[PDB]
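Retro notes
What went well: the complex prediction finally ran end to end.
Inputs used:
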Amino acid sequence: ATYAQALQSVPETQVSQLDNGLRVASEQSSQPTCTVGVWIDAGSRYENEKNNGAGYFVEHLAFKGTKNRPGSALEKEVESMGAHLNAYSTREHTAYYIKALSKDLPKAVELLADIVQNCSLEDSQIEKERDVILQELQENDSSMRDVVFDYLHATAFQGTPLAQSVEGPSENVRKLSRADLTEYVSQHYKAPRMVLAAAGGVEHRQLLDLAQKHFSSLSGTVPAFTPCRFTGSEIRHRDDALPLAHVAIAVEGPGWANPDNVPLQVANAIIGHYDSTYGGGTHMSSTLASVAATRKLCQSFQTFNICYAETGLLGAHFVCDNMSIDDMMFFLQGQWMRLCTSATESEVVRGKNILRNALVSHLDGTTPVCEDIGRSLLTYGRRIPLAEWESRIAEVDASVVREVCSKYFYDQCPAVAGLGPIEQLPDYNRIRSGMFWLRF
Amino acid sequence: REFGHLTRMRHVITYSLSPFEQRAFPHYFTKGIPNVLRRTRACILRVAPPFVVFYLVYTWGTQEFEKSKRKNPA
């Protein structure tokens, strides 16, 4: 194959639906292991200030027992077959999945339906998980990146439910009752909002029969989603006891289904990423990475394209000592401007190659493919094939990158989060002025 | 003295808005006028009396000086 025949030879995601509206999607291989999961259109952005944290609490109680499998029994079953049960929650999505052997798919599927359908939500377990969730909140406080991105979401989407954190404030953790959680599950764990994905040695017809045997009870065939205003704003938490400062800056980027995402991702690949444990250092094609390695300006920087249904965070996060924040801002915004006005074809080619490599390398293993299927059916209503992603990347050039980075970056108000010894984090007006060029 | 090495500061959070998200003259009169009146009552008895004394002294000196150039019958 020539990577054009290899893309054309990738197995096809097969999608069906139950009468209740539960979608069933699978990518089959010849591997002897599979990943099967449920992805739900439920998150913190669906929570208000009183219920905020309920979804994380329900994820916490997910494996602690159902009416059929009390307490540890479920875990025992999973552990007794060599399978791995995992879960996660975001501001928009929730997922419960099993990594099992291909011959364990029936039981795995059964284990999932029970988990999403019949969680006990027992009050004793609710108190134990209350204690656990409080300790995990204090554990999350120690992670400067998690805090700085929660801050970025809180100031960018202030007044909206997208500013909410996934876990909610600790006061809600202490106040959430069983009635709160049962209401959350009854309003958000619905078949039309769920996707049963499976990647690996899984036949779609057999998975569909399993879903019709285990999920057909679910809601047949309503509060959901209001848009979230973006705000140019800054939140600076100064703690000079912290050794390194974290700075996250983002403009309003596109939502999930916007084609602008493909050129913008290309542009982010042009800026790239860095940390001080890199081989390439000063020789890196990314200008910011080479300046950061030559001057030791930062410990790391990453570009990001966070997407929600209708908006997102397009920007960069960097970590540096107190005396270099300013420099890190100057060279980062400059790169943004250099892309808006003078993108240049060869680095667009490099960024396109980086994006194709990221997309292909990410989908390695049954679990990434299962997540791709579930999250893709939630965000696009479809699994976009890699051949299509390649078609969209192939139609990117320096004119396209210049135009889209102009549309999203140039002369736009960013949202800014600073955490730590951030006295040298530039004043908001100085950053905002760094978002345009007078020469241009 | 440069930004980044001025002091130690801890546990202080600041929230700011973009200038393009907010107004430049919000409540400029409904709040500004009471503030000017408050700032005027706060200082008026510290500033005004010396200038009242100057007005009186100036008034007296001028009228007296001009009261000396007048002919006194003699």
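What we learned: Helices of chain B lie at 32-68.
What to try next: split runs per interface for comparison.
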